[PDB]
Design an enzyme around this catalytic site. Structure first.
Site, mmCIF file in Angstrom:
data_model
loop_
_atom_site.group_PDB
_atom_site.id
_atom_site.type_symbol
_atom_site.label_atom_id
_atom_site.label_comp_id
_atom_site.label_asym_id
_atom_site.label_seq_id
_atom_site.Cartn_x
_atom_site.Cartn_y
_atom_site.Cartn_z
ATOM 1 N N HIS A 102 0.851 -1.184 0.000
ATOM 2 C CA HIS A 102 0.000 0.000 0.000
ATOM 3 C C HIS A 102 0.885 1.232 0.000
ATOM 4 O O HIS A 102 2.032 1.193 0.465
ATOM 5 C CB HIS A 102 -0.911 0.012 1.257
ATOM 6 C CG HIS A 102 -0.149 0.132 2.545
ATOM 7 N ND1 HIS A 102 0.349 -0.962 3.222
ATOM 8 C CD2 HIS A 102 0.207 1.220 3.279
ATOM 9 C CE1 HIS A 102 1.016 -0.558 4.292
ATOM 10 N NE2 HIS A 102 0.957 0.761 4.352
ATOM 11 N N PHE B 63 5.646 9.694 0.676
ATOM 12 C CA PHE B 63 4.791 8.610 0.221
ATOM 13 C C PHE B 63 5.708 7.454 -0.112
ATOM 14 O O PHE B 63 6.804 7.625 -0.657
ATOM 15 C CB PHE B 63 4.050 9.064 -1.034
ATOM 16 C CG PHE B 63 3.104 10.167 -0.742
ATOM 17 C CD1 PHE B 63 1.922 9.939 -0.081
ATOM 18 C CD2 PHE B 63 3.452 11.491 -1.015
ATOM 19 C CE1 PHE B 63 1.054 10.939 0.258
ATOM 20 C CE2 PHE B 63 2.561 12.500 -0.678
ATOM 21 C CZ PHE B 63 1.406 12.249 -0.063
ATOM 22 N N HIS B 64 5.247 6.258 0.218
ATOM 23 C CA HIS B 64 6.135 5.127 0.034
ATOM 24 C C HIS B 64 5.331 3.860 0.046
ATOM 25 O O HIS B 64 4.247 3.782 0.624
ATOM 26 C CB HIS B 64 7.186 5.018 1.150
ATOM 27 C CG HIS B 64 6.615 4.951 2.511
ATOM 28 N ND1 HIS B 64 6.152 6.051 3.199
ATOM 29 C CD2 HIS B 64 6.316 3.880 3.290
ATOM 30 C CE1 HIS B 64 5.682 5.681 4.380
ATOM 31 N NE2 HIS B 64 5.742 4.365 4.441
ATOM 32 N N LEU B 65 5.973 2.842 -0.513
ATOM 33 C CA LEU B 65 5.502 1.473 -0.457
ATOM 34 C C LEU B 65 6.412 0.755 0.518
ATOM 35 O O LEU B 65 7.571 0.489 0.195
ATOM 36 C CB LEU B 65 5.790 0.908 -1.875
ATOM 37 C CG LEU B 65 5.384 -0.447 -2.200
ATOM 38 C CD1 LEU B 65 3.931 -0.552 -1.988
ATOM 39 C CD2 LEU B 65 5.707 -0.909 -3.557
HETATM 40 N N1 LIG Z 1 7.097 11.511 6.484
HETATM 41 C C1 LIG Z 1 6.355 10.384 6.512
HETATM 42 N N2 LIG Z 1 5.304 10.179 5.688
HETATM 43 C C2 LIG Z 1 4.608 9.062 5.784
HETATM 44 N N3 LIG Z 1 4.806 8.061 6.678
HETATM 45 C C3 LIG Z 1 5.879 8.285 7.426
HETATM 46 C C4 LIG Z 1 6.728 9.379 7.408
HETATM 47 N N4 LIG Z 1 7.700 9.267 8.347
HETATM 48 C C5 LIG Z 1 7.496 8.105 8.925
HETATM 49 N N5 LIG Z 1 6.433 7.470 8.417
HETATM 50 C C6 LIG Z 1 5.931 6.243 8.998
HETATM 51 O O1 LIG Z 1 6.038 5.186 8.147
HETATM 52 C C7 LIG Z 1 5.367 4.104 8.786
HETATM 53 C C8 LIG Z 1 5.065 3.026 7.796
HETATM 54 O O2 LIG Z 1 4.218 3.587 6.822
HETATM 55 P P1 LIG Z 1 3.040 2.771 6.116
HETATM 56 O O3 LIG Z 1 3.697 1.694 5.365
HETATM 57 O O4 LIG Z 1 2.350 3.822 5.294
HETATM 58 O O5 LIG Z 1 2.171 2.176 7.171
HETATM 59 C C9 LIG Z 1 4.178 4.761 9.498
HETATM 60 O O6 LIG Z 1 4.145 4.328 10.849
HETATM 61 C C10 LIG Z 1 4.506 6.249 9.433
HETATM 62 O O7 LIG Z 1 4.393 6.905 10.666
#
Ligand SMILES: Nc1ncnc2c1ncn2[C@@H]1O[C@H](COP(=O)(O)O)[C@@H](O)[C@H]1O
Ligand SMILES: [Cl-]
Length: 188
Positions: free
Chosen positions: A43, A130-132
């Site tokens: 996601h 934004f990331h995967l």
């Molecule tokens: N700048 C950021 N933007 C989005 N997510 C972030 C960032 N810094 C850290 N994260 C963390 O990345 C973790 C994993 O992201 P996700 O895979 O979207 O669940 C989440 O717990 C976010 O808090």
């Protein structure tokens, strides 16, 4: 009927090519942090994980659907390896950060954020990355994963040839998880 964990994201279709790349990347990272575990489902977040009262789940989803229905699909690139922690630094993630397409993700978030505000929920990070996420572990593993390991992971990614997997990914849908329920919606 309870308050439900609610999270909005762009699903990433984990094709065999992608999972096969992870079969190389993840063991490499596991030479530094063995306890990393692959994500089961992939996601790109558009919201924080929030908690929403049960009777507002369907209304929330409908509000999202109305906004996403008008939002044009777009392409993005996610080929830059980055280490993330959650806010408490109790989880560490290896992710692929979005470069091209970031602005379109910002536009998506602006729409999601309006819905969040409509339901008195927290809006997304103001400095979003934004990331995967590809894999995660317990604890703060930045010291082990940043530097040499990250450089090596990036070199593996840089060496991978199919542009459709990471370089030119087309968004198709947005999804809202609430508890164990998953609500999909097409972009335009
Ligand atoms: N700048 C950021 N933007 C989005 N997510 C972030 C960032 N810094 C850290 N994260 C963390 O990345 C973790 C994993 O992201 P996700 O895979 O979207 O669940 C989440 O717990 C976010 O808090
Ligand atoms: Cl370990």
């Amino acid at each position: 009927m309870g308050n439900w964990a609610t999270h909005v994201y762009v699903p990433y279709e984990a094709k065999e090519e992608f999972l096969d790349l992870l079969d190389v990347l993840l063991p490499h990272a596991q030479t530094y942090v063995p306890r990393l575990v692959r994500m089961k489902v992939f996601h790109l977040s558009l919201s924080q994980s929030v908690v929403l009262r049960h009777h507002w789940i369907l209304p929330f989803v409908q509000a999202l659907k109305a906004r996403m229905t008008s939002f044009h699909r777009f392409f993005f690139t996610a080929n830059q390896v980055k280490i993330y922690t959650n806010q408490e630094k109790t989880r560490t993630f290896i992710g692929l950060e979005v470069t091209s397409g970031h602005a379109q993700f910002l536009d998506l978030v602006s729409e999601v954020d309006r819905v969040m505000e409509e339901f008195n929920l927290t809006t997304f990070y103001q400095d979003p990355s934004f990331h995967l996420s590809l894999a995660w572990c317990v604890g703060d593993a930045r010291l082990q994963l940043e530097g040499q390991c990250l450089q090596e992971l990036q070199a593996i990614v840089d060496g991978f040839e199919d542009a459709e997997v990471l370089l030119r990914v087309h968004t198709e849908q947005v999804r809202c998880k609430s508890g164990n329920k998953f609500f999909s919606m097409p972009l335009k």
